[PDB]
RNA sequence: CCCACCCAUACCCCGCCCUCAGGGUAGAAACGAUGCCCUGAGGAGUAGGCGGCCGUGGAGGUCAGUGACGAAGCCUAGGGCGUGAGCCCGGGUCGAACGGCCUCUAGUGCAGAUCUUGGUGGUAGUAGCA
RNA sequence: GGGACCGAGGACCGCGCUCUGCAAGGAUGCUGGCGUAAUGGUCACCAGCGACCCGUCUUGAAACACGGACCAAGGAGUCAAGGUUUUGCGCGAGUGUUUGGGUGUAAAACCCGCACGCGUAAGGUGAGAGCUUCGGCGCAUCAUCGACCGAUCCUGAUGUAUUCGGAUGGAUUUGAGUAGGAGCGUUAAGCCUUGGACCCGAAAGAUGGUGAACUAUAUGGGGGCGAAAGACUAACCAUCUAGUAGCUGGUUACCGCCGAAGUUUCCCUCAGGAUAGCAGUGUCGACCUUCAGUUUUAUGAGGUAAAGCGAAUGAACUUUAAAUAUGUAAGAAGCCCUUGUUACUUAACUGAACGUGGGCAUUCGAAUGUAUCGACACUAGUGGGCCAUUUUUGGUAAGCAGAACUGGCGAUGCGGGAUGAACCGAA
RNA sequence: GAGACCGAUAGCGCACAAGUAGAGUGAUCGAAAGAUGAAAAGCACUUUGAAAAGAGGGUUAAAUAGCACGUGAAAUUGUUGA
């Protein structure tokens, strides 16, 4: 009952914060793609296909390799 | 009106439209009047303005009552301990800002003026320096007092 | 208060008398007495012979103890001293004990007659708490 | 850009009402003192709070009250008082009781409740009377 | 010089002046017509301007919905018991006759025995209303230090029945404590609970009666278990019942004064409570004592803009420093300095706390306002939001969404914007 | 025997030929409705009209009390006046 009362009182702020957090996550996703393309335009060093690991660990690995 | 200008109006005793009050120039009150810039019209009165404001619309606060200044006697009981014993002394102390200007102005009830004879200006709610009526009209408040008496 | 709450006609006479006294005299004693007659009964708690005795134990002898209240007898006080007591009303036992000790009973109108400005008066009120 | 002019319950002067606040009023030629006089200020208002008044049935006291030479009730393109709820008078009808004042008492105040009862409208001299 | 509106009061007093008097604390003098429907007032109509149909309900507001054919009479917070607050009255450490008895002019009134109900069987410092012989006395009550008692944890005295007790000193303890009684009875008003409980209205259940309805044949009537034999478990009438709702509708003269909230926190998941706030009543202490949505001064958080680099160095540079809002403090409710104590502490009379002395009572330590402020107790209605400015976070093609402040609406009439919840002026 | 009770929409459902009229197969349900005048003295007689009734006349203090009867409001209606 205590927990559900807290949820009822703070319900809408949770929705607003979730929406802002998802927009934020979209923002760093696009930003990471931006430095990806900047690095590939500047230079680089790939194979025939491209890394089969997920597109996240892949981008961190390549921007750590430089 | 925001609360800050509301308090300033309450502390300057201007509580009705067309209620005028004498003030001495000093940085604190200059800042107060600058805060109430969008609600008042202020200037420097001359001897004629002070004299006629005291003689025609001069009411004193005698024991918390608005008593017309009809007698040098009542002027003397209310302001005798300051040396002000007549209407001429009151006018001198107000115009030539003397040591006891605070007491003299506090004794003087805020002068309840009428609407000016001849109108304000076509657009009276902007600053006097852009052709309005609000703000600091330096020596033109004498003309405004002529119109408002 | 402009009108007394009580319907006692003699209390109205008293409040009129002390209104005149407070208006035409400089007496804070008279003003306080008028206010105490105006205030209601719960705000006028009783004063006992023990209270007045312990208040006159000091050099306040040969004086008029004045209470705007009812003076009540205290069984715990074995000896009642001489004292000039003025009050609204006395109990039968307090009246008898004061008169047997040698004091005199005074009403407020009498108190006004002998001492209009309350000279040599010690003014008491009862325990409010 | 300049001049004059129009008007809000707004602002200024005056009158009046109410409220609040501040003063005065006894060796009484003295006062609905719950009264009177002076001065100043204020005045929108839902829920709510407080106070004073108006009205109805009955009770005690009083007006040595009113009344068949006309009580009460009712009607009035007749008047007077009160801000108001209301109160008083004139004219017509009517016939047998009624009222003011201080207290007491309560089955005491209506436009609503698809309110209850009763009476009466438009629909309408209409649908209709096979 | 011309015009307009007004004439409040009713012997004298007063301020004065130009003083045989006067425009000096509020209008007098002269004259005319009429002396009655002439003034004035009420009804009917016309004219100019103004003007949505009332109540209920919901919502931030409308709109919708609901009730309204008309009139007369009736028509809805009452009574009892038990609590509680305040006001009046009586008696008062007591109070209450009315169970009953005794009179009686007979349900009245008057009187009273024994019980019974409820209550009852010590200070100092600083203040403080009030007296004062002006030397001081000092009610109630408050802050602190006190003294004692019921209770708790100890400390452990003569002794004692050899196992019985609490005296002294104590404790960051507790009382709805003592600390020189306030209660009882009753009147009036208010609130709470229970009764029909402001009035009207839900489906149900039960007790006792009256009747009929079935191509089912005087009779048989439901269900499941079991091989059976068998064990188990409708309708109308009156009454209980004025049954039970938080839901709907309604809830009856006038005027005057004072007048809101739509919110914080906590508890609990409900047809919500508590605390605070707004409003009001009573009591206590002061006198603009003192306070204040405000400026100024001093000091923080923004070095944000700007000037220079013929100052150094290089928004991240600086001598300086914008605009813009914003927190704290501004005196006797004070600072220090000085030395007496302490169980604290220090190598130490050494520091800290508790006190003494001093210093300024007059500008006592900025301005301006001040239609008083603070404390305690009790009481009623409130717990919704909508729009907009500015600042700010995010996003879309554009929309738009979320916070903070302030402002309009509620409960607010009036002038203007032709019209009109959100506009302008002004209450 | 009384009442700070109610006073014909009140007070018992019933102040009256009221548990009556009436409704229901039945158990049962269950009303409305008082007032001339002191005294009927309750309108002789004439005329019109088939009658009902009307117009004269009459009783009475009053018929502006006619057994559609004390007083006689509102809604609603007719005539006349504006």
Encode burial over C1-16: b for 16+ CB neighbours within 10 A, e otherwise: eeebeeeeeebeebbe
Instruction: Determine whether the distance from the CB of C24 to the nearest atom of strand D is below 7 Å.
Output: yes
**What is the spatial distance between Cα B46 and Cα B142, in angstroms, rounded to a whole number?**
7
Q: Which whole-number Å values give the CA distances from B119 to B38, B75, C25, C120, in the listed order?
A: 19, 35, 58, 72
**What is the spatial distance between Cα C31 and Cα C123, in angstroms, rounded to a whole number?**
13
**What is the spatial distance between Cα B144 and Cα B117, in angstroms, rounded to a whole number?**
9
Beta strands in chain C (DSSP E): 47-48, 64-72, 84-90, 104-106, 121-124
SS3 of residue A8 by DSSP: helix
Closest CA relative to residue C111, chosen from C18, C4, C20: C18
Burial class for A32, CB neighbours closer than 10 Å (0-12, 13-18, 19+): middle
Partners of chain B (3+ Cβ pairs below 8 A): none
Asked if residues B144 and B116 have their Cβ atoms less than 8 Å apart, the reply is yes
The crossing angle, in degrees rounded to 10, of helices A2-9 and A11-42 is: 70
CB proximity list for C70: less than 8 A, separation 6 or greater: C44, C46, C47, C87, C88, C89, C90, C91
**What is the spatial distance between Cα B137 and Cα B116, in angstroms, rounded to a whole number?**
15
Three-point CA angle B25, B27, B32, nearest 5°: 85
Q: Which residues pair with C5 in a beta bridge?
A: none
Residues belonging to chain C: 129
Beta strands in chain A (DSSP E): none
Protein-proximal positions, strand D, CB < 7 A = 1-2, 4-6, 10-13, 21-22, 24-26, 33-34, 39-41
Per DSSP bridges, beta strands B41-42 and B59-62 are: unpaired
**What is the spatial distance between Cα B81 and Cα B62, in angstroms, rounded to a whole number?**
15
**Tokens of residue B88, six digits:** 């001429």
Structure-solving method? cryo-EM
B125 CA from D119 C1′ (Å): 69
Is B38 labeled as ligand-binding?
Answer: no
Look up residue B130 and give its DSSP letter.
Answer: G
Instruction: Determine whether the distance from the CB of B115 to the nearest atom of strand D is below 7 Å.
Output: yes
SS3 of residue B136 by DSSP: strand
**What is the spatial distance between Cα B65 and Cα B56, in angstroms, rounded to a whole number?**
18
A9 CA from D47 C1′ (Å): 29
Q: Which residues pair with C104 in a beta bridge?
A: C84
Q: Which residues pair with B11 in a beta bridge?
A: none
**What is the spatial distance between Cα B49 and Cα A4, in angstroms, rounded to a whole number?**
72
Asked if residues C71 and C62 have their Cβ atoms less than 8 Å apart, the reply is no
CB proximity list for B81: less than 8 A, separation 6 or greater: none
Q: Which whole-number Å values give the CA distances from B130 to A46, B124, B127, B139, B145, in the listed order?
A: 70, 10, 6, 16, 21
**Tokens of residue A55, six digits:** 């597109």
Instruction: Determine whether the distance from the CB of B67 to the nearest atom of strand D is below 7 Å.
Output: yes
Q: Cα B64 vs. chain centroid, distance in angstroms?
A: 19
Residues belonging to chain A: 66
**What is the spatial distance between Cα C93 and Cα A33, in angstroms, rounded to a whole number?**
105
Instruction: Determine whether the distance from the CB of B117 to the nearest atom of strand D is below 7 Å.
Output: no
A2 CA from E203 C1′ (Å): 37
**What is the spatial distance between Cα C14 and Cα C12, in angstroms, rounded to a whole number?**
5
Q: Which whole-number Å values give the CA distances from B63 to B34, B77, B78, B88, in the listed order?
A: 32, 11, 9, 22
Chain position carrying tokens 């404001």: B53
Look up residue C80 and give its DSSP letter.
Answer: P
Asked if residues C85 and C98 have their Cβ atoms less than 8 Å apart, the reply is yes
Q: Cα B24 vs. chain centroid, distance in angstroms?
A: 10
**What is the spatial distance between Cα C6 and Cα C37, in angstroms, rounded to a whole number?**
9
B57 CA from E309 C1′ (Å): 63
């Amino acid at each position: 009952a205590r927990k559900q009362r807290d949820l009822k009182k703070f319900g809408k702020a949770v929705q607003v914060q979730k929406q802002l957090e998802r927009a934020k996550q979209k923002r760093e996703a696009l930003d990471k793609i931006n430095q990806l393309k900047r690095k590939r335009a500047e230079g680089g060093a790939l194979g025939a296909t491209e890394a089969d690991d997920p597109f996240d660990v892949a981008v961190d690995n390549e921007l750590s390799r430089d | 009106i925001p609360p800050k200008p509301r308090k300033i109006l309450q502390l300057l005793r201007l509580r009705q439209i067309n209620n005028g009050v004498f003030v001495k120039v000093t940085k604190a009150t200059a800042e107060m009047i600058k805060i109430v810039e969008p609600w008042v019209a202020y200037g420097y009165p001359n001897l004629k303005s002070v004299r006629e404001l005291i003689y025609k619309r001069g009411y004193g606060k005698v024991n918390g009552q608005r008593i017309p200044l009809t007698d040098n006697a009542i002027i003397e009981e209310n302001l005798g301990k300051y040396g002000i014993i007549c209407i001429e002394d009151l006018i001198h102390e107000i115009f030539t800002v003397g040591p006891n200007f605070k007491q003299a102005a506090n004794f003087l009830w805020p002068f309840k003026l009428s609407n000016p004879n001849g109108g304000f200006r076509p657009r009276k709610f902007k600053h006097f320096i852009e052709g309005g009526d609000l703000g600091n009209r330096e020596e033109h408040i004498n003309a405004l007092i002529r119109a408002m008496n | 208060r402009k009108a007394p709450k009580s319907d006692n006609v003699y209390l109205k006479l008293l409040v009129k008398l002390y209104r005149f006294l407070a208006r035409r005299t400089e007496a804070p004693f008279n003003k306080v007495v008028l206010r105490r007659l105006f205030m209601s009964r719960i705000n006028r708690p009783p004063v006992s012979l023990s209270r007045i005795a312990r208040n006159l134990k000091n050099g306040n002898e040969k004086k008029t103890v004045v209470v705007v209240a009812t003076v009540t007898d205290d069984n715990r006080l074995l000896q009642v001293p001489k004292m000039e007591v003025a009050a609204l009303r006395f109990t039968a036992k307090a009246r008898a004990r004061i008169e047997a000790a040698g004091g005199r009973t005074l009403t407020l109108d009498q108190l006004a007659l002998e001492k209009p400005t309350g000279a040599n008066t010690l003014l008491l009120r009862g325990p409010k708490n």
